[PDB]
């Protein structure tokens, strides 16, 4: 029947892809990186602790000026912090207390949030009345929101738990594009440096390189043995890193189209909740469930430090645009600034 | 040191922290419960867009029970005081799955300090079925525990089966308690109006036991 021959064709194509990937691989990154000087011990100390959240912290995002940031917690508050002086610029109450993501508009006029309400809420920070108002509510997803990222003041990409991403137009509220093809729930996404591409990792242990313009899955990457919780582009937008429940990080390269390096150790057995890079893409700041955040040497995979100051699991972390400080949230309701 | 404008910014920060404290004062005055169970378990009978919150007040104490593909979201609930678990006393043999489900809850890494209230629903159906077990061969070699206090006018076989199910749950309950959380079982029928005081008292002595363990008195 058609089904059988189609199955043989599909498995033949899969094996051909695997064989091509194997052929393209000649020298590993580790072999080439045998002569570069080691990074050396990395010592980071806390500089600010931001208290005021009532419950666990779910998401965190910097501003583009490297000074303001926004955080969301279980209590239903979205708080804007002036990291330099530890001031509360804004405190926004949420209609729904189940929020799992937050974003800060690259221009700085809006913030975004969402969660188990399946709706993405956009808040205007610069009203003429002197307050903060709900600018827009985007609905249409059939599942909970996992991540959202602004492209500009008018466009925002969102990833839901129904295995589909989206690309909205905020003025109207209608999805100009839809991305489908994942098997499980999508847990994260990461816009490219130029905003022309983005990736996403799902519960099916796979990552897909999408295309915002039209919406075709350019490439698919596999190799993780469990869910992928966090994803991030390399600073040059020509690679990315994925963190999963199997206590391993993986560095994928888009051009070669296969895994390059794995960051793991036997004495590490906990999952990974968040990853981030450094301004030069030489450090990889993973966030584990054992309350710590190892600092991997991206080009050698040999650890170079730890950020051990949190009393509970680290649920999110981020690095500023200028690469001057790294913020980390956690389930004890405190954000910490490090450098 | 501060400028004329930075002082006003700090004043705004303080006036925000004031409202944050005012909200925290009420956040800690409520007890959060996680009602759980299957569609046919009888949750709707007990309650007397993926989340169904609820509010009620017992003796000037406010509760925030909210009824809720479970491996992820339930993990983010390590702050509640008690979990209300509803099971059906009738064995398709889906009951085993319930047991398995219970096991998954007990051994979860982030739920090792949350005690579980257990409701064993549908007593009338179980009694009718027994009067009119077979799927668990271990029921043959089971003797009713001496501590049992069966209700008057009850056949000893119904008591045998009922306590067999209850102890089957308590077996996985007591395996690895470690003293940080326990299980509070109850035999709730279809028409029962006292199910709220049971949750009240169980939530009270959960906290009493936590405190006692803090003082090393238990």
């Amino acid at each position: 029947s058609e089904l059988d021959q189609l199955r043989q064709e599909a498995e033949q194509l899969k094996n051909q892809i695997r064989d091509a990937r194997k052929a393209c691989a000649d020298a590993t990154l580790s072999q080439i990186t045998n002569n570069i000087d080691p990074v050396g011990r990395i010592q980071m100390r806390t500089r600010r602790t931001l208290r005021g959240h009532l419950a666990k912290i779910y998401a965190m995002h910097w501003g583009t000026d490297s000074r303001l940031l926004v955080s969301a917690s279980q209590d239903g508050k979205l708080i804007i912090w002036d990291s330099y002086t530890t001031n509360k610029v804004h405190a926004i109450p949420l209609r729904s207390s189940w929020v799992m993501t937050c974003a800060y508009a690259p221009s700085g006029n809006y913030v975004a949030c969402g969660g188990l309400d399946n709706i993405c809420s956009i808040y205007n920070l610069k009203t003429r009345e002197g307050n903060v108002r709900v600018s827009r509510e985007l609905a249409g997803h059939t599942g909970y929101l996992s991540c959202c990222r602004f492209l500009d003041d008018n466009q925002i990409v969102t990833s839901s738990g129904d295995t589909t991403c989206a690309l909205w137009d905020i003025e109207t509220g209608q999805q100009t594009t839809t991305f489908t093809g994942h098997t499980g729930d999508v847990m994260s996404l990461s816009l490219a440096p130029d905003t022309r591409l983005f990736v996403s990792g799902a519960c099916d242990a796979s990552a897909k390189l999408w295309d915002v313009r039209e919406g075709m899955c350019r490439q698919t990457f596999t190799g993780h043995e469990s869910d992928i919780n966090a994803i991030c582009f390399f600073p040059n937008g020509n690679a990315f890193a994925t963190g999963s429940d199997d206590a391993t990080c993986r560095l994928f390269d888009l051009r070669a189209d296969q895994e390059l390096m794995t960051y793991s150790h036997d004495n590490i057995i906990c999952g990974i909740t968040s990853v981030s890079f450094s301004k030069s893409g030489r450090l990889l700041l993973a966030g584990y469930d054992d309350f710590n955040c190892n600092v991997w040497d991206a080009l050698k995979a040999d650890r170079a430090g730890v950020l051990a100051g949190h009393d509970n699991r680290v649920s999110c972390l981020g690095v500023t645009d200028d690469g001057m400080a790294v913020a980390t949230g956690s389930w004890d309701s405190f954000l910490k600034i490090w450098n | 040191t501060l400028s004329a404008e930075d002082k006003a910014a700090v004043e705004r920060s303080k006036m925000i922290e004031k409202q944050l404290q005012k909200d925290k004062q009420v956040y800690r005055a409520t007890h959060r419960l996680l009602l759980l169970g299957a569609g046919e378990s009888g949750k709707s009978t007990i309650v007397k867009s993926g989340i169904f919150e609820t509010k009620f007040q017992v003796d000037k104490v406010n509760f925030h029970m909210f009824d809720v593909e479970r491996r992820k979201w339930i993990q983010c609930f390590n702050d509640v005081t008690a979990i209300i678990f509803v099971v059906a006393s009738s064995s398709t043999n889906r009951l085993q799955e319930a047991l398995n489900l219970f096991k998954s809850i007990w051994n979860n890494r982030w739920l090792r300090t949350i005690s579980v209230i257990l409701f064993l629903n549908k007593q009338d159906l179980l009694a009718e079925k027994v009067l009119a077990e077979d799927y668990f061969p271990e029921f043959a070699r089971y003797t009713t525990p001496e501590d049992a206090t069966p209700e008057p006018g009850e056949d000893p076989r119904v008591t045998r089966a009922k306590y067999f199910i209850r102890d089957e749950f308590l077996r996985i309950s007591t395996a690895s308690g470690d003293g940080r959380h326990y299980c509070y079982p109850h035999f709730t029928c279809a028409v029962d109006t006292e199910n709220i005081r049971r949750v009240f008292n169980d939530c009270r002595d959960i906290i009493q036991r936590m405190h006692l363990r803090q003082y090393e008195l238990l």
Partner: single-chain antibody
Amino acid sequence: DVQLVESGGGLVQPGGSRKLSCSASGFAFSSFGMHWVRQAPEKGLEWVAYISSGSGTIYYADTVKGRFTISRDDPKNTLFLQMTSLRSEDTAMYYCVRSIYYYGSSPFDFWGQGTTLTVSSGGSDIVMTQATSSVPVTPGLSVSISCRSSKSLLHSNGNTYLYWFLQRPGQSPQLLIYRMSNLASGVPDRFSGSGSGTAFTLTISRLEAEDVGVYYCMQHLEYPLTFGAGTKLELK
């Protein structure tokens, strides 16, 4: 939508007392600190009072301290000024001003209509200097106004608290530049602010006929707030 309507003016005999009220409608009143700023008839602006958000800080000018008392009523959105023992120098038009302070905000960005008060006949403060006090201009030509300060306004944190206001004939002032380089909201981008330390210059390009009025500089570095004499732009 935003309105600040002042009332309670008129004729007063010397030594009497009066009350001025400011009804605010169209914005979150409780989130804004308020100022009373007065202008004598043939003179420039002069700061008078200040009451912060929540009534937790009240400042008065040295010329009115003891006599004038400022207050606010948030529930019904009103601002009050009680004046007692009125001299003959308290003849002026009074303006109600709003101001919000947080990182990156724009203070002094809305002035009320103002109310007139007439009374029948019977130090270490920073001084702002506008040496030039008149400039004739023609449409389509670039202008340059200047202000000078007795003290360095550049604060340690990196700010420079200097403001620019434009009063047209018959209308209340209007914010143009805040902190000497940040253009306000709703102002054409031809205006630009500059300066360093103690000398500041406002440059105008593509001048039109709707830019005729008096231009004032003000300092927010430390209280009291002090205005300039007021440069005037004349039509050719």
